[PDB]
Each structure stands twice: as structure tokens, then as C-alpha cells.
Ligand binder design. Structure first.
Ligand SMILES: Nc1ncnc2c1ncn2[C@@H]1O[C@H](COP(=O)(O)OP(=O)(O)O)[C@@H](O)[C@H]1O
Ligand SMILES: Nc1ncnc2c1ncn2[C@@H]1O[C@H](COP(=O)(O)OP(=O)(O)O)[C@@H](O)[C@H]1O
Ligand SMILES: [Ca+2]
Ligand SMILES: [Ca+2]
Ligand SMILES: [Ca+2]
Ligand SMILES: [Ca+2]
Ligand SMILES: [Ca+2]
Ligand SMILES: [Ca+2]
Ligand SMILES: [Cl-]
Lengths: 282, 298
């Protein structure tokens, strides 16, 4: 079964970021999540003290040698990358995706879908390493900050979100979600953009909004991208984005009743009540 | 108080250790704080096994982060599995004692420490022989232990081959200072279609309550079965008496192994095919289609 994801993200012992945010949602949707933990930390960088291990290039290549030797690389219908924060591993991830595409092609499986979440910040070696890696991505899910530093466009509205996304397409990513940005002219909403470049050279663009909740939520992007992989498996990307927005709105609203209790409403991870309208742009 | 500190292996491919334990505990509504003792490509059954192993310094470094952030009083359960590093196995007793003091300081009930002495299977030790003695020393401080028949045999020095020898091995654990022991499976000479298990509970009077039951035997070597079993045991023992928790965990394992077979993971299939289908039936991890009888012995 091609519900098999290689997830190259952070591990934390306490709290829900990276593979701790992504794994439970995807497993609940029936995906096998094969995680490579780029770091193994006590907690996310919110808490006063962070301790633990950071993968180097040699550790990443050693793990790859085990996967390659046991003939697993053809298993990965999906590659999902998040937190890496290491120029040499970001570069090596491109080789890993190319090796997975090759192995799947030779076994006549459907081409892998590489979802690249370019995790860098919010609110240069690594920025440039993501500009190269994104030349081989199928889907990118930048926050507004990552989209701004990668494209060099300040994402502050729909016009500037479109310019940023056009940069991604020219770089070679066909499908972009800028997950949220604030609007001076609409203070109670966050807007998202789904941009799809065809092949024809043409772009289909889709937009919509979610309520802007007061406060700062950790792991939101991480749950979002994992949810997007789950829904986009069987739903067109526009409806996949709507469902994924619906899941985050359920989780944020539940917290309101900073850490997302990702494991607390399994029902809502699979079938949210919030589903965001995702409407084609003319 | 549905928070677990789980000290186990991480594998990228397949279902053993923390990956196998975390999904069921999450479905049962537990927060699983996982310390990954190793980060490997796959379990040891495969021809090639690659990745990183913690040393004592890496383990104490994580513990410092959990301490500094005041997380230790959160842990109502500690569950240890694959460690296979004498120094880290030795350090578990101090970790548990530190969690116990932190809980008392916050007016919380005592933690329950579940020690799965993960050392090997099928007559084969995974790593160095010095790990055996380290587990004898840690088990004195365990509330609950869940050896396979191989682990029960090398720890106690008794070949666990039947009910009589399982009971002798279990008595060794009680003498060592482990009050509650599950020897998860062993052979019945007179019944090759079932596996027998033992639950032994030492009080206090110094009296022992013993229970036994059987599960259907499936022809084939499955791995990760003990890991799902101990995760299920923690989950059900939170709100059931230990004997019923054992029967529910045995029922979880029966559904999970039948699902593995149904999806092609027969005796003769590849190691990859025989990997447990942990994500196939989430409902059956919480609510197994059967519950094994756990019946008192004389
Ligand atoms: N304050 C907020 N109010 C409402 N939804 C939010 C808020 N912050 C995040 N989200 C939701 O979470 C998703 C991902 O969060 P975002 O901040 O875009 O990414 P990241 O967490 O990677 O910085 C958004 O698409 C949106 O659905
Ligand atoms: N081949 C099998 N047939 C039936 N049940 C099995 C089989 N292998 C494992 N089990 C189930 O899995 C549980 C734990 O597996 P066991 O082999 O005893 O532990 P471990 O995985 O630690 O070696 C058993 O108690 C039993 O319920
Ligand atoms: Ca954000
Ligand atoms: Ca993010
Ligand atoms: Ca076994
Ligand atoms: Ca004791
Ligand atoms: Ca075991
Ligand atoms: Ca009960
Ligand atoms: Cl706008």
C-alpha cells in the first residue's frame, strides 16, 4: 500500500513539534510513518532549557545505508521534510529524494510526492540550501516568514503572497501553500494561498481565510503539513487544504477552551467540523 | 496523570520499540514522553542494521532538560524497553527514584515503573552479555516486569519450557524484588496450537497469586509483539486490575497478529511483510475483539 511516508523532522521527548506533531495524525489516517529524527531534544525551543542530540551528515548517511541495503527506499510514496537546520543534510535530502524516485520508477510504482516544509523561522547557508532543495519539491508549505526570506518578497497580502509563490514555481516547486499571513485591511482573519503551476506554464490560484485567534501556537505548521499529506492522498489539493485548515482550527479552538493536545480529539484529526472554503482566483 | 516516560528504541522502518508503543498509548489517551535509546534503520532481524546508539552522557543530557523544565513530576508511569547499554540500564533506578521524589513534592500518587528487560528473542541476545546483570539490579526497583521466556530464562538461570519452570523463573523475579511479573509466552508440549503465559503477583504476606491463560499460536516469527503488549499493559492497568489488563493486552496482540497475517504477513513471508500492522485497526488497539482468560492457579 502506497500510504507510506518518510518523515525527516525533529523529535522532542516533551511536547508536540516535528515528528511528535506529524506522526499521530498520519498514523490515525492509516499511513506508515518512517521517521528519521534530525534532532532528539528534551522539548521545543519555547521552554527555558533545551538539551539533546543533533544528527550530523554521517548519522543521516548511516541510517540511509540501512534503508538502502534492506531495499526499503521503494516503499516511500511520500517524503515529508521539516526541521533539519543543517546545510549538509538539507543538500543530502535532495540525493535521498532522487534515490527514492529512481527506486520507485524501476519498480514501476507511482512517483513519490516530496512535501518540503522549509523550516527556518517565524515572526543563510540553510536558506540557500532550501532554495536548491525546492528545485526538486512537489509541494512546499512555507509559513509567511519562510516564503518571504526564500523569494525575497515581503508576504503581507494576497498580491505579495502570489509573487512569493511565483518564485517557488520558477525555482521548480509546482504546488505551494503559504499557510497563513495577517492582513492590515482584515484584522480578524488569516489568509492562505494555494498556487498550482502546470507543463502548460499556467497557474491555478486558490485562497480563503481562517479566524485569527489571539495567541501563539507551537507545532501548527507541523500538524498542518502532516494533515495536508493525509487529505491530499485521496482529495484534490484545494479540498485537502480546506480539511487541513479545518483540523488546525479544531485544535486551536480546543486549546482556547500554547501546546496543541494533538492526541486529545482523534475524531477531529480525521473529520474536522471547521473546513475552510478554498476558492479559485480569477 | 495519563503521562508516560517511555525509554525504548526508535526505528525508521517497521514496528518495534517506541514507535510500536507510542501509537497504542496515544489512542488510550496517554501523553508519551519518548527517550529514544537508539535511532536505527530497522529492527535486528534484518540482515543490516544501521544508526546511532545513546551513551550514558546522551541519556543524562536529556534527563537534565526534563529536570530543568520541571517535567519529572508529570510521569505517573515509566516504561523501559530496548536500552542494551549497561550504563543507561543502571541509570534507570536513579531516574525512577528522582521521579518518585518529584511526585511526592507535588502531592501526586507514586509512579508505577514497568520494566521490559529487552535483551533478545529466539535464544539470541541482541547486544553485550553484561546487560543481563544490569537488568537483575534494575528489576529489584521495578513494580512490573514483562520478560519473554528467553529473558526470564537468562535472568533467573531457569530454562522456561513449561508452566512449572515459568513459575520457578517468576519466583526468582519476586526474590529479586519485582512484585508483579508477566512471562508473556512459552510452549505447551501437549498443545502446539496455543501459547501459555503466566502472571505472578507477590504481596506483604510473602504470598504469591499466580494466573495462567493461553492464546492461539500463529506459525511465524513476529517482532514488536512484546513492545505493543507492554504498552497495552500500561494503558489497561491504569483502569483495570492487572489480571484483566493482561487479558486485554493478550487480546490486542491476537487482533494485531491476525491483521498482520490477513495483509500477507504469514510465517513464510518477508520480514517486511511480518512487521506488525500497528496502524491497520486503531479501534482493535483500544477495544480488542477478544480478551484472554487469566485464571487463578492453586
Ligand atoms: N493564531 C492563529 N489563528 C488561527 N489559525 C492559526 C493561527 N496560527 C496558526 N494557525 C493555523 O495553523 C496553520 C499553520 O500555522 P502557520 O503559523 O501558518 O505555520 P508555522 O506553524 O509553520 O509557522 C495555519 O494555516 C492556520 O490554519
Ligand atoms: N507467533 C505468535 N503467535 C501468537 N501469539 C504470539 C506470537 N508471537 C507473539 N505472540 C503474542 O505476543 C505476546 C508477546 O510476544 P512474546 O514473543 O512473548 O514477546 P517478545 O516480542 O518480547 O519476544 C505474547 O504474549 C502473545 O500474546
Ligand atoms: Ca507561525
Ligand atoms: Ca513551521
Ligand atoms: Ca518473541
Ligand atoms: Ca522492589
Ligand atoms: Ca521484547
Ligand atoms: Ca475497567
Ligand atoms: Cl489580502
Amino acid at each position: 500500500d502506497d500510504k507510506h511516508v518518510l518523515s525527516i523532522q525533529s523529535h522532542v521527548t516533551h511536547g508536540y513539534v516535528g515528528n511528535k506533531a506529524a506522526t499521530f495524525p498520519l498514523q490515525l489516517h492509516g499511513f506508515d510513518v518512517d521517521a528519521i529524527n534530525t534532532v532528539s531534544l528534551s522539548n521545543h525551543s519555547g521552554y527555558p532549557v533545551i538539551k539533546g542530540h543533533r544528527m550530523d551528515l554521517e548519522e543521516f548517511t548511516t541510517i540511509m545505508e540501512g534503508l538502502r541495503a534492506n531495499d526499503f527506499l521503494s516503499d516511500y510514496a511520500y517524503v515529508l521534510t521539516g526541521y533539519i537546520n543543517n546545510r549538509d543534510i538539507v543538500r543530502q535530502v535532495a540525493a535521498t529524494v532522487a534515490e527514492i524516485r529512481e527506486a520507485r520508477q524501476k519498480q514501476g510504482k507511482k512517483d513519490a510526492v516530496f512535501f518540503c516544509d522549509p523550516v527556518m523561522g517565524d515572526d543563510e547557508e540553510v536558506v540557500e540550501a532550501y532554495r536548491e532543495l525546492l528545485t526538486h519539491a512537489d509541494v512546499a508549505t512555507p509559513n509567511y516568514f519562510e516564503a518571504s526570506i526564500l523569494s525575497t518578497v515581503e508576504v503581507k497580502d494576497l498580491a505579495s503572497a502570489i509573487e512569493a509563490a511565483n518564485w517557488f514555481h520558477t525555482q521548480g516547486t509546482p504546488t505551494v501553500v503559504i499557510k497563513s499571513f495577517a492582513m492590515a485591511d482584515d484584522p480578524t482573519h488569516l489568509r492562505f494561498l494555494l498556487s498550482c503551476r502546470d507543463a502548460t506554464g499556467s497557474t491555478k490560484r486558490y485562497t480563503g481565510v481562517v479566524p485569527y485567534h489571539e495567541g501563539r501556537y507551537t507545532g501548527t505548521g507541523d500538524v498542518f503539513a502532516a494533515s495536508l499529506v493525509a487529505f491530499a492522498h485521496s482529495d484534490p489539493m484545494d479540498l485537502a487544504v480546506g480539511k487541513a485548515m479545518g483540523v488546525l482550527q479544531d485544535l486551536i479552538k480546543a486549546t482556547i477552551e500554547r501546546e496543541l493536545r494533538v492526541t486529545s480529539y482523534p475524531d477531529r484529526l480525521q473529520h474536522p467540523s471547521s473546513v475552510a472554503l478554498v476558492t479559485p482566483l480569477p
